[PDB]
């Protein structure tokens, strides 16, 4: 609802196409921070809603090291960037499980401690 | 120190390269472009014409913006024609 507020102002002025859009600030970014998730949505189900706008190559769900349950945020890289422009913009503020999730562009830095979780995820997304 | 700097640079590069979208990197332009699995049934229309991933459930999920961009897209494209045609004297 922070970002959703921008695009309405932006569009209203007829900004139209990325050169003048704030989405142009990125261009080298693909991963999207996916916030305010419900707790029971897992990687496969976050890999349901987000293929509407593109083809995901990677995904990471943030979850506590001990109990292994959702922190409530994920990082999902689309194959073709412009999906990011599309997902952030179009799907932000949308309800799943009662709570309206947040998306925004992100620069994502991998962490050693999950290293195996990368191949374990990749191998499934490497199937396609 | 120099070696350290070099290492840092390398890591930065790695970070950036990992982050970059795949189609741009091969790029040079603009059933998958990179052979990734693609959907089957007809999808909703889109600004960029991108096709949903094979794994899509098939429900509309949208705030409703993507359709409102077309309304503005059509508008702006229409008033370029209306401006001359409604001109009079």
């Amino acid at each position: 609802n922070k970002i959703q507020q921008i695009n309405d102002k932006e569009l209203q002025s007829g900004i139209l196409s990325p050169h003048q859009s704030w989405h142009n600030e990125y261009k080298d970014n693909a991963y999207i921070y996916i916030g305010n998730l419900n707790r029971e949505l897992t990687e496969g189900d976050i890999l349901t809603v987000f293929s509407e706008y593109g083809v995901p190559v990677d995904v990471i769900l943030s979850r506590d090291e001990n109990t292994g349950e959702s922190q409530g945020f994920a990082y999902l890289k689309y194959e073709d960037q412009r999906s990011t422009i599309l997902a952030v913009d179009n799907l932000n503020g949308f309800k799943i499980g009662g709570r309206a999730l947040k998306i925004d562009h992100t620069f994502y830095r991998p962490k050693r401690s999950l290293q195996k979780y990368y191949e374990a995820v990749k191998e499934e997304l490497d199937r396609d | 120190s120099k070696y350290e700097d070099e290492k840092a640079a390398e890591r930065e590069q790695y970070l950036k390269n990992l982050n970059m979208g795949d189609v741009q990197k091969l790029g040079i332009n603009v059933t998958s472009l990179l052979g990734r699995k693609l959907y089957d049934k007809p999808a909703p229309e889109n600004r960029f014409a991108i096709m949903p991933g094979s794994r899509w459930d098939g429900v509309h999920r949208s705030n409703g913006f993507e359709e409102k961009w077309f309304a503005k897209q059509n508008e702006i494209n229409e008033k370029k024609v209306q401006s001359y045609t409604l001109q009079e004297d």
Partner: peptide, 22 residues
């Protein structure tokens, strides 16, 4: 050698996504 990592992904449907449609 016991487990790769204690965490690991799922790739399993939750009842929430299917439920909302029906």
């Amino acid at each position: 050698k016991s487990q790769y990592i204690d965490i690991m992904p799922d790739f399993s449907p939750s009842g929430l996504l299917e439920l909302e449609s029906n």
